[PDB]
Paper text:
Hotspot mutations in the P-loop of the G-domain such as KRASG12V, KRASG12D, and KRASG12C perturb the normal equilibrium by inhibiting GTP hydrolysis and locking KRAS in its active conformation. In multiple types of cancer, a missense mutation at codon 12 substitutes a glycine for a cysteine, causing hyperactivation of the GTPase and enhanced MAPK signalling.
Following molecular replacement with the apoprotein, electron density in the switch-II pocket indicated an adduct with cysteine 12 with an interatomic distance of 1.83 Å being consistent with a carbon-cysteine bond. Apart from partial density for the Gln 61 sidechain, the switch-II loop is well defined. In the back of the pocket, Lys 16 is positioned 1.9 Å from the carbonyl of the acrylamide to form a hydrogen bond. Tyr 96 sits behind the core to form the hydrophobic base of the pocket. The quinazoline core of divarasib is positioned to form a hydrogen bond with His 95 while Tyr 64 and Glu 62 extend from the switch-II loop to form a lid. The pyridine also coordinates with Asp 69 and Glu 63 via its primary amine at distances of 2.1 Å. In the back of the pocket, a second water molecule forms a network with Glu 63, Arg 68 and the pyridine’s tertiary amine. In contrast, divarasib reaches to make an interaction with Asp 69 while maintaining a hydrogen bond to His 95; a unique combination not seen in the other drug complexes. The most striking observation is the distance between the Cαs at Ser 65 which is 5.6 Å in the sotorasib and divarasib structures.
Numbering used by the authors: 0 to 169
Write the structure that this text describes.
Amino acid sequence: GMTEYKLVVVGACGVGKSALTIQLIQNHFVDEYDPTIEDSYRKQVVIDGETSLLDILDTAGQEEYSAMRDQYMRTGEGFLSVFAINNTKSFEDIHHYREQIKRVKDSEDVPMVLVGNKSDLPSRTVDTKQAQDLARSYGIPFIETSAKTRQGVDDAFYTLVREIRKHKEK
Ligand SMILES: *CCC(=O)N1CCN(c2nc(OC[C@@H]3CCCN3C)nc3c(F)c(-c4nc(N)cc(C)c4C(F)(F)F)c(Cl)cc23)[C@@H](C)C1
Ligand SMILES: Nc1nc2c(ncn2[C@@H]2O[C@H](COP(=O)(O)OP(=O)(O)O)[C@@H](O)[C@H]2O)c(=O)[nH]1
Ligand SMILES: [Mg+2]
């Protein structure tokens, strides 16, 4: 059989949401992707032996708190909270995205995964230990990724699918 998953990639401008989603979907790195383009991208993959249709929302629109916007974001079954390891502000911004997800879901148990992207760059400003401690504080997994080299990309999205699955079995 198969299961579909609405996954949502969030995080500050430029952390690599689009590059991560395109790597997952098409298996290459897109270095210039219009920062304004918001769209969903589909991938079929087997995860732990079950066909999984991933419907991935790559967010990009202006910060907006309308009923329509809240209701759309609520459709996400799981969220990737993406920051870039050479951008400490994107790391601090993670709490804002977690908070907003919690708000529209009116739940403290939303499937989420913390993703530290750009792990191929030497210019790291976010300690891996710090990022691990943050995810532990949320009770969610942490995965270091590079959309450029594809390191950890499968692990990040598949972990999120697994978190949704567990939240179901619960
Ligand atoms: C380069 C353009 C780009 O990638 N984006 C990404 C989306 N986005 C954005 N930004 C913010 O906040 C920007 C900063 C941090 C806090 C102060 N502010 C100035 N917040 C966003 C969101 F909260 C959401 C969002 N919106 C609603 N209504 C509900 C939910 C659950 C969310 C969430 F993302 F958390 F899922 C969105 Cl969709 C996008 C946000 C810009 C940086 C533009
Ligand atoms: N070195 C490196 N650059 C990346 C990586 N992911 C994204 N980028 C670059 O970072 C910038 C923003 O990426 P983009 O996907 O547009 O970010 P978004 O605004 O979160 O969608 C672009 O210059 C990308 O080429 C990565 O893993 N490594
Ligand atoms: Mg983008």
